[PDB]
Amino acid sequence: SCIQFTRHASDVLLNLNRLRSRDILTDVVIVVSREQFRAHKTVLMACSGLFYSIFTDQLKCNLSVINLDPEINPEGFCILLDFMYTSRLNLREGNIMAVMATAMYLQMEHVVDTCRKFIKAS
Amino acid sequence: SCIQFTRHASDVLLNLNRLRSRDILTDVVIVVSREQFRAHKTVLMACSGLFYSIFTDQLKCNLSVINLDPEINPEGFCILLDFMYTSRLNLREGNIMAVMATAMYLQMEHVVDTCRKFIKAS
């Protein structure tokens, strides 16, 4: 018999993104080629099958630095990290291939699905 | 020119609640009278003006244990912690006063607003 506040989840995600922009309580650095991205482990796990697997591992859960596969494009990662914290995906003709490949690696099934649909249309 | 995934914020919150239920990456214990509640600092900050103030403080940001004011009712806190992680508020005739008082202390303005409306109706 609960009541529900419709905007609560969106408001929570907006505040987590504000903490990310101000570098507050970020507990991990994701290294992609030369580029570094600060984030919250819990948000990464909630969005990605790959980060979920990494941070539930008894040894990796304690690492402050995670290095991604050298094939991963920093721009593709940046677009996906922004989506994790906002629900908004900056999908463009010039980045769709790098975004789909990065989403497949990160195990973000809904992003992979929209990339496949957008590629099929063109 | 982004696209948006409608269910993303709700899905993120659902996964953060699953991490909470399994005690994964919880980094703080909130003590309310004899009762202890494990949580994620970032989620508490995103939902509460009081926790936002506590964990942005250069000294308190590093505490693993936070003790609430002895006037705070553990059941009222438990109902509010559940709302933080689910958007669902278990508001009942027998708990509304303890829920409103706890929400005022935690600075959760939307919960305070619905409690005032529900009290006014009765």
Partner: peptide, 4 residues
């Protein structure tokens, strides 16, 4: 607020 809604009835979920």
């Amino acid at each position: 607020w809604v009835i979920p």
